[PDB]
Write a protein that binds this ligand. Structure first.
Ligand code: SF4
Ligand code: SF4
Ligand code: SF4
Ligand code: SF4
Ligand code: FES
Ligand SMILES: [Mg+2]
Ligand SMILES: [Zn+2]
Lengths: 117, 86, 96, 115, 208, 77, 690, 48, 125
């Protein structure tokens, strides 16, 4: 259940789960999420911008409980201190990389906890 | 010194514009035949005294009140403006 | 499917890359630009189209409660295939 | 009609009397504030700032607004005298780090859309 | 009702209504309205001139003796001619009951300080003055308690902007912290969440 | 549920710091007592009010039922 | 009188006979739940969401269709009506797809909101849902019919408002579907409104798909400038970017609808934009420069020449502020050659009398007329909402319509009197039977389009139409303040320019070629460098790079209608003002501010400095430009008609052909429309269809 | 993970990386969207 | 005990608002228009006061929307038009007032759908 650094997950096929519904952005109590979207080249509903300000985030986990497709999660990493302010302003590439980096542990934790949700 | 255009602002229902309304309705057509190339802009005010504007060369503008004037009074004002005499 | 801009920078899956005259490229000097190497559009394009002998079928993304909301896809049109609006998986009736 | 409950002043004369008392107190305090906060400004410019702050409100014709302004100025003086403020609070009256904003039409037209 | 619905307590409702009638009868000079909510909370609306008498009666009367001032605050309603309403919350330990007293004021009318009735009101009235600009007469020492020194405006007013007018930073040229007009790197995103299709028919207003 | 648990309220006698210290220690002991009672009397059932117009539904219901998805959307937006 | 007494939850209210239960409840302040009922459409009564209980009645009634009877007590919040609402919502949600996260109408769904407010909080539907295949009805409306609730709002709107009978229901029972039954595009000037009327995400805007959520958008109320109707609109913006255009309700102008161009041409505001001042370098090419250099270069030429050598042309999207600013600036130069690209006959009264160039009957007045005659115009494309009002009057008031010109499709039947202009003379003389038809009419109306005035016979055509109107007045007598005479304008800047004293047409420029020419958004191509002397100085001020830009010497980037608070006057003579939704991009500035700065640089500083002072100057010139909802005005038909008898120009034997003949000519009219990709897609779709 | 390994995916990193702050491979933030307003391009041919 | 002074209310010197956010602003007093995407009218009941839109620009980092005015998100709700006008006047704000737009009552007749001789007869239902 513990909330760590945010990550963007994807389906087993390799496509990202996020469908740009902007529910996490609407629920975010700190307005830490910025989302922009448009139809993709194949007509899919996908984001072109997904920014999380980690210096504005309160790590409440409301975004992950508002997501209807388990796209945004707050992963178990907590040792991600930074030497500059700028590297704590995450964009979509950073969050997708975090998801690809932590997917094994994230999926194990979700399997452990999803029956309580 | 050359007159460029004349603007007449009269209110549609106010009794202060009755003379201007009568002037227009009776003799604006004759005034327009007399000056076929001079633009006489008739516009409507609202809760404002009737007024007459004259534009001269290089953007010079002067205005005179036509409040409570009869048709003859505003007529004489227009010949005074057109002829250039005070 | 990461491509390279004529300047030399990697073009991300959103297609953006700083122009030649853009001063903002200076932020990547002595550093690097994060680009995710796994393009979702290509990865979902590699998935084979599922063959089902039913007129209407449902998709939930797999895993049951761990996927997306369950939706039903009509497969009456033979010119194209039915695609899930959540997951992107494709379905088709066995023509001929 | 238009009968309202007074705060301190029934009319304008005693409101101006309180204004003059507050001005006297501020004028007296300026040199002590300049010395005690180790300000780089002079006493003349501090008194000029006091005069300017008093003159910003010269248009008020309501005695209640006037005596509320006097109350606010007296709170300001109490903060200054008791050294509850630091040097930054005193120096905030001078806006030394703000680039001047030109007033004429052409400058505002050149800089941006702000009238 | 059902187990998802909060139960009602008619006995406490009747007791509060009776005591509200009692207080209104004893002080007809100041009491303007008495209300009891569905969750058993008693409110007494009074004229501003009666703050000291009503509070003294509620503190000292044998049948009331509200000896504790739980909270004192203000609410800003810009649409009213009297902009601010002052709310007093009192607790009676003798009778295990709570009462609320509301009055009103505007930007220029002072409200009498109640520090003689309750010593706890000293900081509450200071906070009200700091956040709303409501002046309290005969206060021992009225001054800002929450905002920074020299802060201009009253932030808790509805028309005060959320992020204020000035922001602070350290300037190396003058070797001190300076104040400058606010400029957001990202503007606060205003959300229009209120939906049509009105929710509670019991609170429907006449269409005038 | 505080009417369903039993504990004592420590009361001071001198109104000084020592009495408040003793009162706080006694409240710690009484909190241990209440914790014991709560552990021994935990009931079964749901954890939030079974009213989807206030409390969000479960994830499975949100991903299965139309009403649950609508209510989840509206409650989180 | 004839009012009857009825009760809503025990409270009395007096209603007219024929009032339904829904309207009786509305008079009290309650909105009855609805899905199929629309105030603008015919009653359907199929969604059954408006079921309500009448006291002492065992069976609930449909509030949208049941006329209320005297003495009825409507129980709007009784257990019976609440249970009916819950059951109907359950039935509606049984087959609905779980598409809320991917549906474009998440926070704007009537289904979602009414399920939250009147339905249950859970489902007991354990079966599988239905799925239907989507339809392709063009590049404007995206179609996902699994979300359709079969309320038939789109069908009724298409049949009654748009005049297009391409929509319907095929199948039966649960398998009944809304569509065309064939591959066919629902293309009309009002096709985009079915997106608004659709309560669910079955019909959504295709260019708007997936881009924004409703709670994020900021709402700016503004005025459309795509035509001369001036329909009220709402501009949705988010993070300083225009997202979409929504209609804003105004009963007198556009009711609830906007045209497709108005709805979808905002895509052109993000392309081909002018963002920086530009001048010519030594090679003769356009290069970027500062505001100071360009303004000084223009001011030097302005000071070099005076009088007749300085001229200005105003485009179709110019506000009154910029118009009066330019007029004052050129008057300080002693230049009166201030012209517009649109032509109006100056003979006789000209622009001196305001009623000579206005739609005197007004848009709302069409509902009162019994006979209307259209001369040399295509109202369907030139003024889509005016044509919609005509169609509504034809449908509901049994209005009789006749046309002189090309037999265009107007979405209603009319009488084609012919094509030749001599028919006007025949009607005025009295030989044509339509003259007698107009004679019997109690509220006759004659409409002449400015497109018919664009040809060389404009004065003669106007004289013939005025003769017809004068014959009507002389024969049928004075019915009152009916104002038979009318003119339909096509561009949003024409009426304001005529009110300010601009010379209609560009004949003055051709007669007296200038050496300094101002192009205030002029992209009509009326004047090119061939019509100008050698080394003529051309200044183009505008917001788009179009036909007017490349031939200019100095380019001044201006603001579009969405980027300024600007005054526009519609074809009725009603003045309206826009509001700032976003700021101009780059170095672009407000137009009147540019003119005032240029005046200061040249030493001819203008008195006004703020927008309020500009509007004070507008009031000084034409006081009606500051009355922001007034349409009333004095009728001077007799004077203009008498003055029109002086000249006797002859009519040519050329058929009346409107510029827009089919739908393909409607999408591309102005610089904003020509820079829009959505308009290009519409043109491609109508040219070749799939 | 030796007794029961994590689920294998094609997109999961094969090589784990540590914290790279204060290092040339550090994360550098940037906007991931395209230009919103397109400028007009003047023609290359002189008018006269 | 009562001054009985005749002067219009003015509290600009007490609100702490900067000088250039008082004289250069233009508030709009209006009833918000109904969102035409929905049929509900519960959002068109009260009066609103909003400020004129100022410049928004793109942050060089993150491309976020930056602003320089503090009143870009300030919206006030009023019961009546007179209350909003009084509030705007006492705060020293220049205002524009827009009259409330009400949908006019209409005549609906289900029987007109099946008309014997009028054009209101529907071709389908
Ligand atoms: S954890 Fe909370 S604060 Fe952080 S992004 Fe998610 S919703 Fe926002
Ligand atoms: S992360 Fe989840 S909640 Fe946020 S926009 Fe994407 S799908 Fe919606
Ligand atoms: S139409 Fe409404 S209820 Fe249906 S999926 Fe879209 S938002 Fe949800
Ligand atoms: S498409 Fe929309 S408007 Fe048409 S019938 Fe279906 S729900 Fe109604
Ligand atoms: S609204 Fe009456 S049945 Fe649909
Ligand atoms: Mg829709
Ligand atoms: Zn799927």
């Amino acid at each position: 259940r513990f909330r760590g650094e945010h990550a963007l997950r994807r389906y087993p096929s390799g496509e990202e789960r996020c469908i740009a519904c902007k529910l996490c952005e609407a629920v975010c109590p700190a307005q830490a999420i910025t989302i922009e979207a448009e139809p993709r080249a194949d007509g899919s509903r996908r984001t072109t911008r997904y920014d999380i300000d980690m210096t504005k985030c309160i790590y409440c986990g409301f975004c992950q409980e508002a997501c209807p497709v388990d796209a945004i999660v707050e992963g178990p990493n907590f040792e991600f201190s930074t030497e500059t302010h700028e590297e704590l302003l995450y964009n979509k590439e950073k969050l997708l990389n975090n998801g690809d980096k932590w997917e094994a542990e994230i999926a194990a934790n979700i399997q452990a906890d999803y029956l309580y949700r | 010194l050359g007159l460029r255009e004349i603007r007449i602002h009269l209110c549609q229902r106010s009794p202060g514009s009755q003379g201007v309304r009568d002037f227009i309705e009776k003799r604006y057509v004759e005034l327009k035949k007399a000056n076929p190339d001079l633009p006489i802009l008739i516009r409507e005010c609202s809760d404002v005294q009737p007024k007459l504007w004259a534009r001269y060369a290089f953007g010079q503008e002067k205005n005179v009140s036509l409040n409570n004037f009869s048709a003859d009074q505003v007529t004489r004002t227009l010949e005074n403006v057109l002829s250039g005499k005070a | 499917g990461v491509r390279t801009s004529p300047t030399g920078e990697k073009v991300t899956h959103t297609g953006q890359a700083y122009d030649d005259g853009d001063y903002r490229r200076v932020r990547f000097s002595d550093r690097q630009k994060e680009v995710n190497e796994n393009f979702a559009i290509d990865l979902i394009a590699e998935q084979p189209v599922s063959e089902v002998g039913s007129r209407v079928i449902s998709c939930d993304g797999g895993g049951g409660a761990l996927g997306h909301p369950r939706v039903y896809i009509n497969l009456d049109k033979e010119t194209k295939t039915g695609t899930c609006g959540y997951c992107g998986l494709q379905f088709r009736q066995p023509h001929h | 009609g238009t009968s309202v409950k007074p705060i301190f002043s029934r009319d304008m004369n005693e409101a101006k009397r309180r204004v003059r008392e507050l001005y006297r107190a501020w004028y007296r305090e300026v040199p002590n504030t300049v010395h005690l906060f180790q300000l780089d400004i002079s006493v003349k410019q501090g008194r000029d700032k006091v005069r300017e702050m008093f003159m910003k409100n010269a248009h008020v014709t309501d005695p209640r607004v006037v005596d509320l302004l006097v109350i606010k100025g007296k709170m300001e003086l109490e903060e200054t005298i008791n050294v509850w403020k630091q040097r930054t609070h005193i120096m905030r009256f001078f806006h030394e780090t703000e680039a001047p904003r030109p007033t004429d039409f052409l400058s505002k037209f050149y800089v941006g859309h702000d009238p | 009702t059902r187990p998802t619905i909060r139960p009602r307590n008619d006995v406490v409702h009747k007791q509060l209504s009776a005591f509200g009638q009692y207080v209104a009868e004893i002080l007809p000079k100041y009491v303007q309205q008495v209300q009891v909510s569905c969750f058993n909370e008693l409110e007494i609306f009074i004229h501003p001139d009666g703050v000291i008498p009503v509070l003294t009666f509620l503190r000292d009367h044998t049948n009331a003796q509200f000896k504790s001032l739980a909270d004192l605050t203000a609410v800003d309603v810009p649409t009213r001619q009297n902009r601010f309403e002052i709310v007093y919350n009192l607790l009676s330990l003798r009778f295990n009951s709570r009462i609320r007293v509301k009055t009103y004021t505007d930007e220029l009318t002072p409200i009498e300080s109640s520090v003689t009735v309750y010593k706890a009101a000293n900081w509450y009235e200071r906070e009200i003055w700091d956040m709303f600009g409501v002046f309290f007469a005969n206060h021992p020492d009225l001054r800002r308690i929450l905002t920074d020194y020299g802060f201009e405006g009253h932030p808790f007013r509805k028309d005060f902007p959320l992020s204020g007018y000035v922001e602070l930073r350290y300037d190396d040229e003058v070797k001190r912290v300076v104040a400058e007009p606010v400029e957001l790197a990202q503007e606060f995103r205003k959300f229009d969440l209120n939906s049509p299709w009105e929710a509670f028919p019991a609170y429907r207003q006449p269409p005038e | 549920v505080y009417d369903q648990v039993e504990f004592d309220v420590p009361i001071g006698s001198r109104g000084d710091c020592y009495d408040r210290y003793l009162c706080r220690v006694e409240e710690m002991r009484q909190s241990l007592r209440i914790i014991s009672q709560c552990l021994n009397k935990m009931p079964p059932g749901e954890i939030k009010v079974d009213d989807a117009k206030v409390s969000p539904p479960k994830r499975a219901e949100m991903k299965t039922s139309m009403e649950s998805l609508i209510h989840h959307f509206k409650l989180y937006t | 009188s004839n009012l009857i007494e009825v009760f809503v939850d025990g409270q009395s209210v007096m209603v007219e006979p024929g009032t339904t239960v829904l309207q009786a409840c509305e008079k009290v302040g309650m909105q009855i739940p609805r899905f199929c009922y629309h105030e603008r459409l015919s009653v359907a009564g199929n969604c059954r969401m408006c079921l309500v209980e009448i006291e002492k009645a065992p069976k609930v009634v449909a509030a949208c269709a049941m006329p209320v009877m005297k003495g009825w007590n409507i129980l709007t919040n009784s257990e019976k009506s609440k249970k009916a609402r819950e059951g109907v919502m359950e039935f509606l949600l049984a087959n609905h797809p779980l598409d809320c996260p991917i549906c474009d109408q998440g926070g704007e769904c009537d289904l979602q909101d009414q399920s939250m407010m009147f339905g249950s909080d859970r489902s007991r539907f354990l079966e599988g849902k239905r799925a239907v295949e989507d339809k392709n009805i063009g590049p404007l409306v995206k179609t996902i019919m699994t979300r359709c609730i079969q309320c038939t709002r789109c069908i009724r709107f298409a049949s009654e408002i748009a005049g297009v009978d391409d929509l319907g229901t095929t199948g039966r029972g649960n398998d009944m579907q809304v569509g065309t039954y064939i591959e066919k595009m629902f293309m009309s000037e009002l096709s985009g409104n079915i997106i608004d009327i659709c309560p669910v995400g079955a019909l959504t805007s295709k260019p708007y798909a997936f881009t924004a959520r409703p709670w994020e958008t900021r709402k700016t109320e503004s005025i459309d400038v795509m035509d001369a109707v001036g329909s009220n609109i709402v501009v949705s913006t988010r993070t300083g970017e225009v997202m979409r255009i929504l209609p804003r309700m105004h009963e007198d102008i556009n009711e609830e609808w906007i045209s497709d161009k108005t709805r979808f041409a905002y895509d052109g505001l993000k392309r081909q934009r002018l963002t920086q001042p530009m001048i010519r370098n030594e090679k003769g090419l356009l290069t970027y420069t500062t505001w100071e250099d360009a303004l000084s270069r223009v001011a030097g030429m302005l000071q070099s020449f005076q009088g007749n050598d300085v001229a200005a042309i105003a485009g179709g999207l110019v506000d009154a502020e910029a118009l009066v600013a330019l007029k004052d600036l050129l008057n300080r130069v002693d230049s009166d050659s201030l012209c517009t690209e649109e032509v109006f006959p100056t003979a006789g009264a000209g622009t001196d009398l305001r009623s000579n160039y206005l739609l005197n009957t007004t848009i709302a007045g069409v509902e009162e007329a019994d006979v209307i005659l259209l001369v040399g115009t295509n109202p369907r494309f030139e003024a889509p909402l005016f044509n919609a009002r005509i169609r509504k009057s034809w449908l509901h008031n049994d209005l009789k319509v006749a046309l002189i010109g090309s037999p265009v499709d107007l979405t209603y039947r009319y009488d084609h009197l012919g094509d030749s202009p001599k028919i006007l003379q025949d009607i005025a003389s009295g030989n044509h039977p339509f003259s007698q038809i107009l004679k019997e009419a109690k509220k006759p109306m004659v409409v002449l389009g400015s497109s018919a005035l664009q040809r060389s016979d404009g004065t003669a055509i106007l004289a013939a139409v005025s003769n017809i109107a004068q014959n009507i007045r002389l024969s049928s007598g004075v019915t009152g303040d009916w104002k038979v005479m009318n003119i339909l304008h096509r561009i949003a800047s024409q009426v304001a320019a005529l009110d300010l004293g601009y010379k209609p047409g560009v004949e003055a420029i051709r007669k007296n070629p200038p050496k300094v020419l101002f192009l205030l958004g002029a992209d009509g191509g009326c004047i090119t460098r061939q019509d100008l002397p050698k080394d003529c100085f051309i200044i183009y001020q505008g917001h788009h790079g179009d036909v007017g830009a490349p031939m200019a010497d100095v380019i001044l980037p201006g603001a579009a209608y969405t980027e300024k608070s600007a005054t526009y006057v519609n074809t009725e003579g009603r003045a309206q003002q826009t509001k700032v939704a976003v700021t101009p991009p780059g170095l672009a500035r407000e137009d009147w501010k540019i003119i005032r700065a240029l005046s200061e640089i040249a030493g001819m500083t203008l008195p006004y400095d703020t927008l309020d002072q500009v509007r004070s100057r507008l009031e000084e010139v034409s006081p009606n430009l500051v009355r922001y909802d007034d349409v009333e005005g004095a009728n001077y038909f007799q004077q203009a008609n008498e003055l029109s008898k002086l000249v006797n120009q002859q009519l040519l034997a050329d058929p009346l052909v409107p510029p827009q003949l089919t739908i393909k000519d409607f999408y591309m009219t102005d610089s904003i429309s020509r820079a829009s990709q959505t308009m290009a897609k519409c043109v491609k779709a109508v040219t070749e269809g799939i | 993970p030796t007794t029961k390994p994590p689920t294998a995916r094609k997109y999961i990193w094969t090589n784990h990386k540590f914290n790279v702050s204060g290092t040339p491979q550090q994360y550098v933030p940037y906007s991931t969207t395209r230009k919103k307003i397109q400028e007009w391009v003047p023609p290359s041919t002189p008018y006269k | 005990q009562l001054i009985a002074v005749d002067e219009k209310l003015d509290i600009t010197t007490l609100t702490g608002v900067p000088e250039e956010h008082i004289k250069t602003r233009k508030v709009r007093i209006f009833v918000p228009a109904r969102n035409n995407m929905q049929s509900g009218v519960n959002n068109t009941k009260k009066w609103k006061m909003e400020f004129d839109t100022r410049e928004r620009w793109e942050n060089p980092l993150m491309g976020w929307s930056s602003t320089a005015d503090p009143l870009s998100n300030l919206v006030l709700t009023f019961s009546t038009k007179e209350d909003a006008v009084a509030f705007a006047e006492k705060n020293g704000w220049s205002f524009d007032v827009e009259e409330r737009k009400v949908p006019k009552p209409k005549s609906k007749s289900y029987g007109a759908n099946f008309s014997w001789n009028k054009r209101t007869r529907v071709s389908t239902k």
